[PDB]
Every structure is written in structure tokens, then in C-alpha cells.
């Protein structure tokens, strides 16, 4: 019923047509940073829990207070980290055989759909290292006109956007 179903299904279809047509290697690492912060948080949480289970409380007050204040400010910087880096950008892919060339011309892509509104937005940008400059393409559309409750979310009705994408990539990479 919510929009998140068609959001992540269209994101999975976009990654599928990306890997099926453009042949670029997807990567990550902000997810690895989330692994880092969650594993470190669970590390000192379980250490504090075992240390409070094995030892009485009034000799264990002050450094436990320091640990929970450290966790509170760590969750605060995690919240502003999320709100400053992970708004809607969901995938990053790198190219194949950079023989003698610097690892540049890399694209980020994001899908924007606000709270209960019929305005889908597809924003994809790329850093081109020829002039060290970013170019962003934007789509302000809606997809739910033609198909019905059966869910015809097929490539055979959405291919002109991918056609615009690959011939724009052709005229931008010459």
C-alpha cells in the first residue's frame, strides 16, 4: 500500500537493467561503514553488559555513564552523518579495464519520492575527471498511468528512458 514497494522494486529493476545492458561492476563501502559503526556499538554494548553482569553497580557507575554518553553522541553524529550523506543515493558502479587512465567519471544515482505524492524523480549525476566536474540528469515524471493492478512493471513499457540514458552516455563520451 505504501510507496516503498514500487520504490525498491523499481530500484531493483534499474539495477537489473544496469547489469544486463551497461555491464559495470557495482560496489559499496558506505554499507561497510554502517557495518563498522554497528559492530563497534554492539562490541562495547556487549562488553558493558557482561561487565555489569559480573560486577556490582555502585563500583561500576561512572565509566558506564561515560560509555552511554559516548554512545549518545555517537548516535548523534551517526544521525547527522545519515542526513548529510545518505539522503537518496542508492548505488555506485565502476568501469572495467582502466588501462593507463585515472579512476574517474563515476556516477551516483538517487530516486526521490516524498510523503504520499504523485511525483517520482530520478536524479543521476557523475563526476567526470576531464575537468573535475559533475553533470546531473533529472527526471520528474510518474509511471502509474498505463498499467493496472496486475503489476505490469516491465522493461517493454519503460525502455525509452533507458534509450535516452544510453544515447546521452554515447553523446557525452563521444
Amino acid at each position: 500500500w505504501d510507496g516503498s514497494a514500487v520504490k525498491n522494486s523499481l530500484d531493483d529493476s534499474a539495477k537489473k537493467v544496469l547489469l544486463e545492458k551497461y555491464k559495470y561492476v557495482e560496489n559499496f563501502g558506505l554499507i561497510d561503514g554502517r557495518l563498522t559503526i554497528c559492530t563497534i556499538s554492539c562490541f562495547f554494548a556487549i562488553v558493558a553488559l557482561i561487565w555489569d553482569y559480573m560486577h556490582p553497580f555502585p563500583e561500576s557507575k561512572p565509566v558506564l555513564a561515560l560509555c552511554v554518553i559516548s554512545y549518545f553522541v555517537m548516535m548523534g553524529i551517526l544521525t547527522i552523518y545519515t542526513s548529510y550523506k545518505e539522503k537518496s543515493i542508492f548505488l555506485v558502479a565502476h568501469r572495467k579495464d582502466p588501462t593507463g587512465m585515472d579512476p574517474d567519471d563515476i556516477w551516483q544515482l538517487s530516486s526521490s519520492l516524498k510523503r504520499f505524492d504523485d511525483k517520482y524523480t530520478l536524479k543521476l549525476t557523475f563526476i567526470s575527471g576531464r575537468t573535475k566536474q559533475q553533470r546531473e540528469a533529472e527526471f520528474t515524471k510518474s509511471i502509474a498511468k498505463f498499467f493496472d493492478h496486475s503489476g505490469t512493471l516491465v522493461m517493454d513499457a519503460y525502455e525509452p528512458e533507458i534509450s535516452r540514458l544510453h544515447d546521452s552516455l554515447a553523446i557525452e563520451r563521444k
Binding site: 500500500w1 505504501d2 510507496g3 514497494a5 514500487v6 522494486s9 504520499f116 505524492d117 504523485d118 502509474a144 498511468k145 498505463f146 498499467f147 493496472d148 493492478h149 496486475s150 503489476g151 505490469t152 512493471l153
Partner: protein, 86 residues
């Protein structure tokens, strides 16, 4: 193909701004019942009247929430632009 359109085939096939104004009316009648509740608790000077007004407002919200609104279901495209058929 058709092996993934089974469970993820239900978005909201309804209006948007109609439910926007509807939820505006829901929050409006909730805040109206709340403000008349605490001013009648300030006037009548006992808490059971405030309890009765809050429970009556919750019952009115349930009686305005549970109904299907069949006309809205019949015409989601009454305000939304008309979708096409596959």
C-alpha cells in the same frame, strides 16, 4: 519476468490530495475535541468530563476511519488524473 510481480503488485491506486484534505480533517477534529476537552475540564473542574470527551473523540475518529468511503474507491480518478488500462 512474471516470477516477481506476485507480491509487490500493490501500490496505492487511489487519490492523493483527497486523502491529504481528509487527514487534515482528522487532525482538525482531533485537535478540536482535545481543546474543548481541556477547556471544559478547566470550567467544570473534574477530570471525568475530559476522559469522556477524549474517548468520544476517539470513537468519532474510529467511526470516521472504519467506513470504506466507497465513492472514493469507486472514483479514485475523480480528482487524480485518469489512469490507462493495460
Amino acid at each position: 519476468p512474471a516470477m516477481l510481480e506476485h507480491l509487490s503488485s500493490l501500490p496505492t491506486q487511489m487519490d492523493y490530495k483527497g486523502q491529504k484534505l481528509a487527514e487534515q480533517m482528522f487532525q482538525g477534529i482531533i485537535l478540536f475535541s482535545a481543546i474543548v476537552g481541556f477547556i471544559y475540564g478547566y470550567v467544570a473542574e473534574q477530570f471525568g468530563w475530559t476522559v469522556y470527551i477524549v474517548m468520544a473523540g476517539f470513537a468519532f475518529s474510529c467511526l470516521l476511519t472504519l467506513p470504506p468511503w466507497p465513492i472514493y474507491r469507486r472514483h479514485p480518478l475523480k480528482w487524480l488524473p485518469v489512469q490507462e488500462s493495460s
